Every structure is written in C-alpha cells, then in structure tokens.
C-alpha cells in the first residue's frame, strides 16, 4: 500500500494506490483506500484493510454525533485525538496506519497515525509498503508554498513511485483535494496507467461444453 | 491444524449481462479423508445468495446466524434485504468477532430488485469487503480460481454463456486442489428466475 499527504498554501491533498493483496495474490485490482471521516476530513489507510475501514467508520460516526451535539463543523484534531486514544487502548492489536487530512474552522491539517497510537505532523507524509519509494520522490521535489495543481502532481508522482517500484502497490491513483472555503473533491481513479492490454484470444466456450447432472428452478419469492 | 484448510472447499461468483452466477464444490473432508459429497456452501435469504468456504462448523453457524438476522430484518423493514445492505451486515457480523474470528471466506451474490444491477462481493475472515465488477473467488483453490477466472472471464456474458465460463473456471481449479471437488453446484441468477445446476466432475 502507498498513501501520501501533501500540504499546499490554501489546503491539503491526499493520494493512494488501488491494489489490495492477500500474500502475493492481488485480490482487488481497483480498491478505494481513501475514506470520508466527515465531509471535509478524509483518511488514507494502510496495514490490516479490515482494521483501517472499521476504525475510520467508528470515529466518522462519533464525529458526526459530536458535530450535531456541538452544532459545529468537525475538527481534524478531534478525529486525530479519538483515533489515537482508541488505537492506544488496543496496544497495536488494531493494525491501522492512517494519514488523516482535512480543513476545518481552524485551517488545513495533515497528520499520520500508527497502530500503537503515535501521531506525527508534517507538510508531506507517506505510509505503507511503498512509503520509501513515495518519500524518495517527496524529498526530491517538495518545496514550501506549493499550488493546488503542483501538490496534486507531487502527490500522484509519489504514489506512481510506489506503483512501479513497490510490489505491494499497483493499479491506479485515487486523489482527494481539501481546499479551504471549498467542498472537498474526491478524484476516484485520477490516473489509470495500468490498463490490461487486449487478450490474444476469446475463451467464450461453445454452449454445452460443460457436462450437467441436474437442473432445477430455485424459489426466491414467498 | 490450519482451520481454513481442514474441511476444504471453494466458492466462485461472476457477473454477466443483467445476471450473476455463484458456484461451489460439494466436498467436506477431515484433511485427507473425504466424509461428505453433499455439503453445499451456497445459501440464500430471499433473492440475496451467500457462499461460504472455510471451517465447516463456522459455514453452518454463519448460515444459521444470517437466516436469523435477515428474518428479523424482513419483519421490521417489511421487505427483503438487498445485496448491498446484506454485504454490510456480513461485514459488521464478522468484525464483531475481530479477536476470535469465524474461519470463513464468504461471497455475496444477487441482483438489486430496485435498480436491477448485478452485484457480487467477497470478504476476508475479519470482515473486510472486496467489491468487484468481474468475479470473486474463495477457498483452498483460490489461487487456481484466480488464474482460471482472470483468463476465461469477459464482460457482459449472457446467462447461458456465463454458465459455461463459471463452470469451467470451478471444475479445472478444483481438479488441481486435493481438498476441493467431489461434485459442484452452479446458480444462474436473473432478475426474477434462478436456475440451479449440478455439474458432472471427476470424483477423486
């Protein structure tokens, strides 16, 4: 898994690859690793896929209830505090490694959370097996006062480094841009540079090829 | 003593043009010893079909559990559960037992009665959802099934063609696995008719 977060002058952008694997086998060729905690707070997850999904949805649910109770748009630090207290309670047994990013009344924020409940702050972060490939690109090209279009390019380039060089990462690039005073735009399959080439042959079987012992109509109705 | 490969077995689901197919082998063994050649791994709750591979006691337990839950759902909602919703229920139920899980590889298949869209999904043992346009595979011959499906499959197959593709995918995968086979069942699912076929396969 390759997930990055990049800060720009008026917001934050997060990107991720689209490959899910069990051991060396690719289970999902196009999987969504970008999750919505709240409308303007988005999360990218690496580690145990089930754990990142579950912890994201739980805090997302509690953040919605908190937002309704306080009659206020939720803050990134609230999502961060609730996540890291929950992850710390389970002493790393919940294998969720998250890049949390968003905009709130306070401004734009970018954090990373580790399974044991440690948090980091940065202008550029990368998590997952392809983090070292991604961080190499970020360390080479990142600068202060990035524009929106520059931050998307840098983020997608860092993910691509993972896709090509890391076996754990592959397929497409998902991006989410959270800009201040604007709706967050989720760019599902922003890049698709790994399209399957036309097969040499159609393996459509002549009808009757398979030998059949019994047929029966199944009753789905009442 | 690997719970997922004691009893053995496989499930595969595929999407076609306005239809879905879900198929499973019939073997239940205790490692080397074949015990039952009638153990079906595909169940249904209304028009939503669920295949379950893995430890057979958990296959049985989860079927009984989802029948329980879909029955209460129908009484309260006054309508049959849809595949997208059921998928979420399976995920919730599996992750509830996160630190003592059911050793299973479930596969949801069905057509949304409102939208008419073909839907398939697979889960890991802790309940992570694997949604797919093309196909889902599960069981002791998942590697073999992945290889068969990825090569044989093409989009928008007609029910009669989709039947041949999924059947050949299961049969040839099952014959390269010791713990799978001993008979097979294929469900062809259209909007408002479902055909269930028993395949003839080698019995070793």
């Amino acid at each position: 898994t390759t997930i990055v977060g990049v800060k720009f002058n008026n917001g934050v952008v997060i990107a991720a690859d689209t490959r899910s694997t069990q051991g060396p086998i690719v289970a999902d060729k196009n999987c969504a690793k970008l999750h919505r905690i709240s409308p303007k707070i988005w999360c990218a997850g690496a580690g145990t896929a089930a754990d990142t999904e579950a912890v994201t949805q739980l805090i997302g649910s509690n953040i919605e209830l908190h937002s309704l109770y306080t009659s206020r748009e939720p803050r990134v630090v609230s999502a961060l505090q609730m996540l890291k207290q929950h992850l710390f309670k389970y002493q790393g047994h919940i294998g969720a490694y998250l890049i949390v990013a968003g905009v709130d009344p306070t401004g734009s924020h970018l954090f990373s959370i580790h399974a044991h409940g440690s948090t980091d702050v940065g202008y550029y972060l990368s998590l997952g097996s392809g983090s070292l490939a991604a961080m190499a690109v970020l360390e080479s090209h990142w600068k202060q006062d990035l524009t929106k279009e520059e931050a998307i390019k840098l983020a997608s380039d860092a993910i691509q480094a993972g896709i090509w060089n890391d076996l754990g990462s592959g397929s497409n690039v998902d991006v989410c841009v959270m800009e201040i005073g604007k709706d967050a735009e989720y760019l599902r399959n922003y890049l698709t540079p790994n399209v399957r080439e036309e097969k040499q042959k159609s393996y459509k079987f002549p009808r009757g090829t398979t030998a059949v012992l019994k047929e029966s109509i199944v009753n789905i109705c009442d | 003593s690997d719970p997922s490969s004691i009893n053995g077995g496989i499930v595969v689901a595929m999407t076609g043009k306005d239809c879905v197919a879900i198929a499973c082998d019939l073997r239940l063994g205790s490692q080397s010893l074949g015990v039952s050649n009638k153990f079906e791994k595909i169940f249904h709750y209304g028009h939503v079909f669920l295949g379950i591979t893995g430890l057979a006691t958990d296959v049985t337990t989860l079927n009984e559990m989802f029948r329980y839950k879909t029955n209460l759902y129908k009484l309260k909602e006054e309508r049959a559960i849809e595949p997208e919703t059921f998928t979420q229920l399976v995920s919730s139920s599996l992750y509830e037992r996160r630190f003592g899980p059911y050793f299973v590889g479930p596969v949801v298949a069905g057509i949304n009665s409102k939208s008419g869209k073909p839907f398939i999904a697979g889960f890991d043992l802790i309940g992570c959802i694997d949604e797919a346009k093309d196909f889902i595979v599960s069981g002791t011959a998942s590697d073999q099934l992945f290889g068969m499906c990825e090569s044989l499959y093409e989009p928008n197959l007609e029910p009669e063609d989709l039947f041949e593709t999924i059947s050949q995918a299961l049969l040839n995968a099952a014959d390269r696995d010791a713990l799978s086979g001993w008979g097979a069942v294929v469900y062809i699912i259209k909007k408002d008719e479902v055909v269930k076929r028993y395949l003839k396969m080698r019995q070793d």
């Binding site: 898994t1 690859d17 490959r19 899910s20 694997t21 069990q22 289970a27 999902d28 999987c31 690793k33 997850g45 690496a46 580690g47 145990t48 896929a49 089930a50 990142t52 997952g128 754990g168 | 890991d124 043992l125 802790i126 992570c128 694997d130």
Partner: peptide
C-alpha cells in the same frame, strides 16, 4: 486477511 487482506492488506494494502
């Protein structure tokens, strides 16, 4: 399980 699944990992990404």
């Amino acid at each position: 399980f699944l990992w990404x």
